[PDB]
Amino acid sequence: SLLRLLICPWLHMEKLIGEADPASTSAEIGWHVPREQLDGFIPYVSIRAPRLVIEELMEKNWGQYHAQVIVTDQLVVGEPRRVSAKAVIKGNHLPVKLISRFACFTLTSKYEMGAAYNARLAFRSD
């Protein structure tokens, strides 16, 4: 009952987006910060969907929820610049209805790219 959720939908997304480009099928949603001290973003969830879904998931009120984000200074061992950011939500939690029943998302993930900033999120376009 868990593992079919883990594996089975991405076979159908493979069937549907076997040919479209990543520059129209990829998407990303997460927490945002407006300026540089010591343009800025926290990658929360990754969604891949067809364009006839993303163009309606563009304008939905993602910028509704609030978390308390924490920024430190150490490198990741991975090759881009990523600091192991921290974040605690001071509101509600994001409903899974809001994404779709027509698209699938990565279930669990670890977010990456100072002091506490306490800002809100938005949608990252493609």
Partner: protein, 1253 residues
Amino acid sequence: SMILTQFGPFIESISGITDQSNDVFENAAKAFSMFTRSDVYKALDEIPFSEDAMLPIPPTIYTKPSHDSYYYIDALNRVRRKTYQGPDDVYVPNCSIVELLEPHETLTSYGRLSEAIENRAKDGDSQARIATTYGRIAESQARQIKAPLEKFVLALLVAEAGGSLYDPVLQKYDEIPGLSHNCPLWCFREICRHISGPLPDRAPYLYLSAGVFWLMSPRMTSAIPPLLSDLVNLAILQQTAGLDPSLVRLGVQICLHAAASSSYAWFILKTKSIFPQNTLHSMYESLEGGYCPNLEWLEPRSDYKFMYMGAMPLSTKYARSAPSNDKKARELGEKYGLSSVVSELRRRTKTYSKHDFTSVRYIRDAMACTSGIFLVRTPTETVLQEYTQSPEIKVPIPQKDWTGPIGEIRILKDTTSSIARYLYRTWYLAAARMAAQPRTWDPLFQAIMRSQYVTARGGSGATLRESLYAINVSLPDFKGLPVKAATKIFQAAQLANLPFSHTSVAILADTSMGLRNQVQRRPRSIMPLNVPQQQVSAPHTLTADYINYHMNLSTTVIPLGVYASSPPNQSINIDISACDASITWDFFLSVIMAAIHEGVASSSIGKPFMGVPASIVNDESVVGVRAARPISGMQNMIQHLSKLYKRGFSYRVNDSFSPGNDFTHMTTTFPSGSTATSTEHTANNSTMMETFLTVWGPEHTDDPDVLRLMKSLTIQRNYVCQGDDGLMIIDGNTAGKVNSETIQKMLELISKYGEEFGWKYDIAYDGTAEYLKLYFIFGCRIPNLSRHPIVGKERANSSAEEPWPAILDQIMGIFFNGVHDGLQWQRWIRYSWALCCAFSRQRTMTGESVGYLQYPMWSFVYWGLPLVKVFGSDPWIFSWYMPTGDLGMYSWISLIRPLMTRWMVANGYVTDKCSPVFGNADYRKCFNELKLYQGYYMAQLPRNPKKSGRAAPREVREQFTQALSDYLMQNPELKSRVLRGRSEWEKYGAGIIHNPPSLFDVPHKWYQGAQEAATATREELAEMDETLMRARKHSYSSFSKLLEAYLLVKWRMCEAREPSVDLRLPLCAGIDPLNSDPFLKMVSVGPMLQSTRKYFAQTLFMAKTVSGLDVNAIDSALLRLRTLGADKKALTAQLLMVGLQESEADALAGKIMLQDVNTVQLARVVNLAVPDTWMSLDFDTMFKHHVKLLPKDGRHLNTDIPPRMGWLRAILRFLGAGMAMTATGVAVDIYLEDIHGGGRSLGQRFMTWMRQE
């Protein structure tokens, strides 16, 4: 002498020396308000002391370290305190408050915090957050006080300086010491002098509705207000209850060592069991005599009806056979450096061996001398301390013993060696014969229970509406309505049209935290639930109410403990530590849901409940095969409750004291606030004690002694439990007291029962008894005085407080709390006068005028203040047992009315119209000059009136009322019955009542009750102010119609009643010949000996007598229609407003006519009520046996009653009882002197009063 100069006349206006006029009472109020804090402490420095009050005080209280090392930050960004001495060490320290303040603008040496700390805290500076947490929690700890403490001290001064007090019973002055002997006053002013120092101000803080301000001396500690509160508490309770000076020195030593500690409130929590353990729990080692009560818990073992067999002399075999108290008490005294106080208590407790008034008085003193603060801490610390606990289930049910599941729930095999089979069987049979009765299937009962969880501080409506927003439904917001967002009625209103399968997801939202504070206990945290999960939690509390009323039927007061502590009988006090952290799904709720699923399963086949339809699941319960069987509505609700209690609970946390710390987390504790809370806890206590006594006892012992005991000790005869507390009744045999060693073997076996499957029985075998925190020794009640503190008020929120017209009502509550316990009445009543006049004047700030709002004394005399000496009468003339209203007003006015008339012709106010009540003397000039009428009518003005007043849009309120009525309905047959009754009413019953209580004013009444939390400020308060002003300037004609109807009745007293109980028995502590008046009333009248929940439930004429709309109005209106003519169909229409089914409603309306009702019934006709002070006494005795008509002179033809309308007899009994008892002395029998008009004209006047509402 300073207060003597301003209170030349007033201090003996209220000490029984000169006559109490009104003008000196208002002069006193002028001098009360026009007054300041430097005057407070120079009055305090004025008095000397007499070398028994003085004690050395260590300077180590004051110089204190900083709070920087005391708090830290959670990994999830939460401020949390670092512990030092155990995990209980989480509170406010008394340290470093001087440097967190900015001095006030128009003040010099006081002020509040600097704000830039809170700017940095809202920016996220860590030390700034720690600083604002510490400042606001010290603000909260100082917030816990009702009034300025200085005015309490000044009320002590103006009361106390009148001196010795004559007693009309004992013909002596009192022998209590005066001002010059109290350690609290001298030590209090010593603390204030040293903390203020040579600085020009003196008061270390000022109380204010906007918030407390601190004095800036560098030696100031933060926990000085609870120390000052304990000082003023013991300062009152000496001179108002007759404590000895020595134990007060002990108690203030405890308080000073508490303020000298690391943190104050932690030491207070850990210290709270010194006064009981060394005095109460070690008392009567080897007596020689005394007199104990003889009771009998009668043959119906749920009656709570007691026949008092009389006094019984004691003997030396009734010594304390309870085990020792040396070890743990001396270890507690050694542990906190307090060996001296424990050594003194264990010295003097040994010195008493006679069960008389002196020993029980000393125990009362020991109970009073403990502290009375309110334990205040950060809310996050609570919900991360007590909601992080799991029970210790050492023997769980093995996984082989459950069947294949049915839906979500596995079922117990019945060949299971585990204990929970018996629990399964009890809840199984109880659910079966619960669903067997058709009384659960009344749709009016459905409407009652749906209305039942509209109570109990409903919250989380925000989280309801955004979870409901998340599950994608359209939503009426109802724009432009005042309170509604913070209401549970809106929670019900949003789901008045919705299908159950579309709302079953929405029972998964989180839960708000409502906080309270307690006396000497950790701050409890009530929580509501939203309305769909309170709705789906029904059959649980159905079967719980079934257990508590039918099956084990234990309880839901006072002579319960009198029977339990009676010497041949023996009691065992059994609690649990932290009940709600034990009921989890691991061992209980699985078995509970399985048994409530299967017990109904025979009777439930296709029955639907309201709201919920049927369904189907499968089962592995027939493990060779697998099938799917349909599911009825009971089982549907249980199937929905299963995942909620199996899952765990989510709790939102938001405080006002730490800056933005919001979080939710999982917690497996059953909620403290629910409909199914206390009844389920009682049912679980009863069932576990039953399983104990049935199987687990003889399975785990050796000797015949304890098993031969517990065979005869079943739960139907010996056990009572209400939530936390339980209680053994050990029957004394023919040999007297049961041997103790068997009982200690038994109780260590109960402790084993607790530790082995997730309980912890706090077992206390002590030879005494507690029950609902009420202490009983040898059949004598102990009034605990800690749990009614005068000064403290629980304010767990920093929300701003309601202004002046209700603090006076809490002063009235302080007065009644002092009434219900055994306090020295000469010195309690006069101090109550002092407080009462101290909170009279107000000094408003209204526009263009400096207004003074003045109550006369007469509003308070209407509210039950006993007058001392009025119109030149004798001092201390009547008691405080007056019914607080027109009844008691009538009683004491008619005791002294001819002496009144002689005082009337003095300073001659004469007009030749011979009144029937005062004769040649008038009343209208003088009683307005004395403003008797002004205060008398001001007393009925409504206090703290908040109103909607804004003229909200009517269409949105109308659709709100319609949605509310849709919530009120589940069956339109209810609507058919009540609309049919409305038709019958508009035919017949309308008109002559001017106000029918109905069931469709109930949406209007729910709206009116929901609109009483707007806390709006300006306009209606100004309207109340001008209402008081135009009530004050208005000159009045005569009294109330009730009172004028009463003033034709006279009476005649003679032959004081024979005694009820023996006076040589200590009935309650604090009452004796020395406390002459209330003790002598207790001896003459006799104690109640009933639970009075049962007795006053016999009074309510409706059977189930619940509707959600004050059923007293129902029964009173029914009896009003009964006496005012009104053919039977109008009575049925008034009952069809409730609309039972109309057939038995027609039957009840036929019954009500010809049956002669109880005496207490007809009180509600005339809007009479038994006041709160009488239920200690047996009242029904002197109603139906002693106050009477046909006096000993004989018949008079004015002492006659017509054959119709014999409802007057009850009211004559009430008024005669009031006149017989309000005076001091023995409750003499009272006989009817004539009524001046005849019963026809008199009852005709009552008819004319009831022509209106």
